[PDB]
Symmetry: C5
Subunit: 344 residues, 5 copies
């Protein structure tokens, strides 16, 4: 017959009255648009900005009865992306965009095909920088739910409804992993229908659950803080007469733990509430600060001058108890700490 | 009848003489444009740049009597965003833009509908990076008023007037919170009418009051500075004969407080005036510097050599007074400090 | 009569022969364009890049005799910004642009009106990132002259001349302040006429004098460096026999002044010449380094072993002189330093 | 004859029915497109982002039988880049784009020529920021394979197939080197054919093997960590009675190795697994921490008080063994460390 | 006569057959394009990226015999920049672009004039971020040659040849200086003709020699490293019995030189080879590390216990030699260091 781009010009042209400014089934039931995404890339999950960059394929399927055809023999017509301003498309957008763009290198990365019954598959490649509010109450032990929601801008609910398709509404690429997180397989899919003073608009959202990787923050924060707590415990085996030894040991431990506690929040939003690393670095600062208060008690009691034999023997007694007591209380703190942030 | 995009072409076309270059009620009363915003996102409130990024819906309502219609049956006509260059729109802009853009992903995020009496609702999605001058006289205890003001660029006051609508002129999204601030519910709305050598132009502004969250700067700055002040107080329980103990303790405290004071302004504009954290870190540096001056007085008096018994007894006297005096003066400073920055 | 956009089409149309590609008074005297700017914002004055971002209104006034009219009743015609490609405009640019853009949000922020005698006022909103070479010979005590110059790109001097208007050629917004600088009221306005191998082109420039704010760099740099110099002076009251006290005091002062001197240039261009903060941090490093050389002289002379009584008495003599001499020489340095950088 | 741009208009025009929306050999065998790249620049290989920027020439060759000609005398026709919207081109894209753009300065950097048999050579200049997932199990001793893959967006496999040409499918510029890597000559070239719910699409990929340069991380990380381990060994030659000497030596070594271990990951993604520099900095932290535990054993045993002669002689024995044992165990660790990361 | 824009329409129009898609002297000798640049700005010479930003005027001169005219009286015709798509222009580009853009503020910054014999001067303003590979073998003492090369993209050598003009092919603006470099007056100009599998293309390049400024890196790196080497020399005047004095002095010097050596490469590419600052900071680290090894030899020999008088006298002997030997070997190193990096 005739080539399919010229058959498709006769289906959009001024003859037969196709208008791309007018939705299908006009003055009728609303247009059902079913959607699924394919996640190509996922990452750069910043927390100062509380956003994340994603790279998706956005597929949209609806039915335009004006685009049905029976003269042409074959079952689909790929419309060229140069001619996409000539058919109706839904005005989908993302309610938490914070910036987005198309991909237009070597060709506009757009795709459209029309079936004989008028089904329109429309797939485009988008980069999004989506805004998700972080919750950092238990910071290395948290699960983050970063969402993405797909709305209509102009058409209200009586004109256009979005749905997810039941055949796998969110696909993820095969070798897509994350450096700081893992992405769970189960993904929540529900409705987020918005009301304004203009009207009610359709909205569908997808929730992605991100569990952090534990092993980074152990190496940088938990293990070096635990060694300085042990470093304060070797003061209890040094002689009492070595005054600049046991004093200078407690000085350097209590101010490196001040340095370690500052760098524990070096890449974080300035939230007001306390978090799980903040109650680690505060309690571990309490051990290295009370280990130096132990020697100030030993240095004061032993210089109380039989009055000299009773003073040395009493100050020797606290130095035997504190060799047992401080690794015993720090042990029963690590029980109550790690059990609390494993059951939660 | 006929489809509404073709009815609306006859209302904008060369027949009946609609010109999009000419305001409504021309050579008459000025055009009353009433406006309200809907804040989607709000954040990245930088203070080096003294700006903030916002994401809004900007709704504008005016009346064009040329756009009234009575033939068409239904009560509103949604103009398609491809045809927005064909009607008159006000030339609103933001007097403190510092950069702005539209959102054009999957569709231009624009919306326009026309009522039968000629009312035009026009809503667009904008990202703004608005400039607000910070005032940091009492820096963790301040309330910041960051404004946004909406002006006319070309039309003067006799041609076009902006107003806020009385039915909630600033709406905020439901779960919109801030990491470092809270946004108060009451929002000032007043006029900011500008005069130039060109004419007088309409301006309406909205004021947003941002109160900081206290709890961040306690954990990083106030509490670690307070421990080093206590760390200088354990020198008064160490023996006088331990010279490298009490000297080396006062050295390390006075130079970590120098380090803590530098990082207190690590993310701030280089303002000339003194602020509330600067008078904390200066006075707390005075305690750790005068605690080391106490031992230099003890070390000088005790080496004055009955001449030896009077010198040891006098230098012992100041070491008993300073165990009481320095936690007593630092206590009555924290009364006068925190009362001053709670009443203000 | 007829609406003014259609009267203005007849004044630019193919009838009557108006060509926007041809300057006014062609083959005649040069076009006199008078200019003034209105500074909306001013700031982000970087010194690594040696630039500054400004936000201006650029008003241009010239006379086109082809645009004179007498049929129309009223005295001015606002041309719509959609039709600005249809009249002649001067090809002004900035010789130190380093990047610039227009503002096009909700409308192109452009403005044009034509008087009956043919005067054309043309105002546009521009953001510029203008390049100014810094001079940092006396860095906290300097006055910076950052310029902006306005040239013609295509038309030579015999075709087009730029001028400033005598009625306030540079206006500044009312509440426009700077965090690190102040902007003086008097602004130089002179000519910067360029010669190339193409021709001679018109240029007008405006000079803005920026005096720094003193009070920032006192708090961060001068005052903490002055305390470490005093911290080296308490070594002269500590006993000579306390060897790790007076040695360990001079060690920690001389290497924190090394740390303080590195951070004094943390946000500066890597200029080769010496500056006023560099001769502060070098001389203040000389006091804390010679205070430790004082004890190495005391420790060597006192161990020369009547031979023991003469050695202790001679080494005691330098420790009495240096308690007076080092705060006396540092006092007469601060006289010669601050007088030099107040008279300059 | 006639000029070649007018001969080429008759080959694309409405006469003879050339349609740029329709692939060659339509309703026939698929279009074979053979490709090769020329790498101009290569670098900025970030690992926080896990991407790399490349600058390429992308040459594509296919055959359009509609573009064959025999009237014109000469053997090739360079189509001008202004007229590239008039012929068919493949819709190639990059499956790991993460941002890309064209080069359009002084001319669109595009090139197209057509042979007499209808072969179309099409070369364009592209900048890409391609995403490659890093694997950092053995971080200074790793080989990274960063890929780039070239897909079809709209045409499925039955319509369009990509191939590499057998005559050098990846050329690299002559003096192209890397600061942190070397680029091996052998480059893998294989197929990456994608399946979606839309269809199967062609994909060819090229693999680039990047071996790091060893010599940087020796100078900054391995050598300064090895000196602090030696710095802990001079404690075994200092006298036992010098308590603040041997204690204060072990304090400062164990907390600079904490500082050196933090900066070893200062520019890295926050991966959970352990890497080769992490097992260097942990074991080297174990030597400087057990060298201080050696003196705490010496200080405890020597103060056990013939009871005094046996205690000094036993604590002297461990100080002779540890002068041999600690440089002997650190020597046999460096054998097992560097052999493991040379055989892998 | 008639206005020159209408005379120039008749010279480009469909009458007389001017085609902008066809080069001058077609099917003849190649087009000789002579070029010169005018450097407005120059700077931001990054070395992590190994690039530099420049701001130029690019003037191009060729001869089109189709553009010769004799009817018009005056000797040149300035074509308006709105009509630049209507004449032929060469497809120049930069082979090391790494990003570039035009300047389009208040007018496209473009310029074109045509003489009576058909000479076409074409000048445009470009910002470039050109890629130059750094060579850092002798880093503060190096001369960098950063090039820029100008190629043809589509036309081969038989169609288009680039040349520099002999009358000053590279001009630099008058007050253009650099903060970290100086720009030598003599500039190399030679050919860089490229061969591909497509053809051979013309290329001309210009070489700019950049000599660094010495005086920055003396103040930050060489002088503070030299003081810590002197700071290790005052240990040789402190008494041997002061064990925490001479030990704690050598500890703090050897770990600040570790800190100073890390910050010496804080803004550098991670190159594998050693450089001139790396052999300064390594040798200066060897002096402060061997000064602490000197005391460990003194502390071991003096505790060997006539056996006590011989041990003190031998350990006193090395402390007299090392007061002379270490400032003597560091003096003869600074001779061999600075002579080597002045002759090279
Ligand atoms: C879009 O989908 C829904 C159902 O999935 C359809 O809405 C219903 O249509 C039936 C009959 O037309 C009515 O009985 C219902 O009242 C409608 N609403 C609901 C919630 O079930 C709708 O017709 C579909 N639109 C199109 C064009 O097919
Ligand atoms: C816009 O609103 C104002 C009032 O809200 C109108 O301005 C007044 O109009 C009345 C009668 O037309 C006059 O008596 C007043 O002098 C006007 N000014 C004020 C300050 O009240 C104006 O007419 C409205 N414009 C339109 C098109 O409706
Ligand atoms: C632009 O302004 C200058 C004067 O401000 C005019 O130039 C002078 O014009 C007069 C008479 O036309 C001559 O006597 C002078 O030689 C001109 N030059 C100078 C330096 O005074 C010029 O005519 C004005 N151009 C227009 C269109 O008005
Ligand atoms: C593209 O290349 C392949 C071979 O390189 C061609 O595909 C084969 O064509 C032959 C005969 O046409 C068939 O026998 C084969 O079944 C085809 N497939 C394979 C895998 O060999 C193809 O014809 C070429 N397309 C064009 C337009 O030349
Ligand atoms: C461009 O310049 C070169 C010389 O500068 C010209 O090329 C030569 O032309 C002459 C006579 O036409 C020949 O004898 C030579 O063989 C050519 N090549 C060389 C290397 O000298 C060329 O003709 C000029 N092109 C134009 C249009 O003038």
């Amino acid at each position: 017959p005739m080539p399919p781009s010229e058959f498709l010009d006769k289906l959009m042209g001024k003859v037969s009255g196709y208008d791309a400014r007018i939705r299908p089934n006009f003055k009728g039931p609303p247009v059902n648009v079913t959607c699924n995404i394919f996640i190509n890339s996922f990452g750069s999950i910043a927390e100062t900005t509380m956003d994340y960059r994603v790279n998706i394929f956005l597929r949209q399927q609806w039915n335009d009865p004006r685009l049905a055809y029976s003269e042409y023999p074959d079952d689909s017509l790929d419309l060229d992306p140069s001619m996409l301003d000539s058919i109706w498309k839904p005005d989908l957008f993302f309610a938490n965009e914070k910036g987005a763009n198309f991909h237009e290198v070597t060709t506009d990365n757009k795709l459209l095909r029309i079936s004989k019954n008028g089904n329109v598959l429309y797939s485009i490649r988008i980069t999004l920088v989506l805004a998700c509010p972080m919750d950092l109450k238990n910071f290395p032990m948290d699960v983050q739910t970063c969402i993405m929601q797909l709305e209509s801008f102009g058409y209200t609910m009586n004109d256009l409804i979005f749905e997810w398709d039941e055949k796998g509404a969110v696909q993820v690429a095969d070798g897509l992993t994350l450096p700081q997180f893992i992405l769970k397989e189960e993904k929540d899919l529900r409705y987020c229908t918005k009301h304004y003073n203009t009207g009610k608009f359709t909205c569908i959202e997808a929730r992605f659950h991100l569990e952090r990787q534990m092993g980074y923050y152990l190496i940088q924060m938990y293990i070096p803080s635990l060694l300085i707590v042990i470093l304060s415990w070797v003061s209890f085996w040094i002689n009492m007469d070595a005054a600049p030894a046991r004093v200078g040991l407690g000085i350097t431990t209590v101010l490196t733990m001040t340095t370690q506690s500052s760098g524990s929040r070096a890449s974080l939003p300035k939230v007001s509430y306390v978090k799980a690393i903040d109650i680690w670095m505060a309690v571990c600062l309490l051990f290295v600060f009370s280990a130096l208060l132990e020697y100030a008690a030993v240095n004061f009691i032993a210089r109380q001058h039989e009055m000299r034999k009773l003073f040395i023997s009493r100050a020797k007694r606290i130095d035997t108890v504190s060799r047992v007591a401080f690794p015993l209380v720090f042990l029963i703190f690590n029980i109550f700490y790690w059990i609390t942030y494993k059951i939660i």
